[PDB]
Write a protein that binds this DNA or RNA. Sequence first.
DNA 1: AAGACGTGGAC
DNA 2: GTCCACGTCT
Length: 344
Amino acid sequence: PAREFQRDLLDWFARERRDLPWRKDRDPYKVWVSEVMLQQTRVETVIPYFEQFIDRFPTLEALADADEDEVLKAWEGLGYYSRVRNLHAAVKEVKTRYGGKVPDDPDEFSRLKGVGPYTVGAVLSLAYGVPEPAVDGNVMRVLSRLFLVTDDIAKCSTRKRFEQIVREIMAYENPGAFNEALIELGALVCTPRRPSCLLCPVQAYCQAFAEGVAEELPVKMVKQVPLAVAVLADDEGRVLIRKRDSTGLLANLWEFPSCETDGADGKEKLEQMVGLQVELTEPIVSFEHAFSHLVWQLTVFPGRLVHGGPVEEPYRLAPEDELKAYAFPVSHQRVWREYKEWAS
DNA sequence: AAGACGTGGAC
DNA sequence: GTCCACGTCT
Ligand code: SF4
Ligand code: NA
């Protein structure tokens, strides 16, 4: 009863659609940026970042031409920073390989880094009208309730199944609208907790509602790392920072020099990291920072740095008022915050 | 197949 | 505390 389903869904969407910043138009760049920003991030969090980011990088080409530090700094605080290194690389490739036009073919677009099955669907359906499914966590919830699908959401195959369902029931007349409506339904009505079934526009089609199980769907299924962090100031009040490797945790972000210590075993593995001259006094605060897959237990040790050689490697001597220029992870932003109200 | 990869806010 | 949060890449 897909034509039935479509009308009721599409009609609700026309009345209820939020005026989000990225819905001002269907510019593929604009759509693409927002969809990358919205991955594992709440709409409310994204709104300010999207605006500053577009203000700063108005077009695809502006973004491609920007320094990566510039781009990381625009992302600073959003999390999952490889989203933006991927977006940046991908956007560079569209400029050069595709004349600056986001490819409207699913296979070509999917090949860009950071661009996966969901992003292909979202961007190409919204921006160009391509009939590809755009199945996110939202959509998976909706479809898992509509169709009483009890496969584990984490399984790669479950997503494939959902996409089949979309290809079957999608309004091919208007795929962007259909895809966006499915998403908005998940965002506003068919919510993780307490879905608003009595108000849902597609309730008559929904099995979970008829079975009394809306809330139990979809079905679905961390290590500790101790860290010592050094804040080292000149007599000129210039602070020692460093850029992280381009691979792995918090890639390419700047940090106050640190190392994993495994147990509260000293400030010496800190004082060790030489290659220039430092004595370290007693630590001033200790807090912890959660990631998705680990927790940092941080201890920050204030210190005095003397120059006895050049500054190379990934380290860099930044004066105090220039720290605000670099992208720091939130954890290391707090390290600095504590260090400063300390020195009061 | 499943772990890496941030962050903040509702509950 | 938990869940959001499949999103993508590995
Ligand atoms: S009826 Fe309840 S469960 Fe079924 S789609 Fe609408 S909100 Fe989701
Ligand atoms: Na890809």
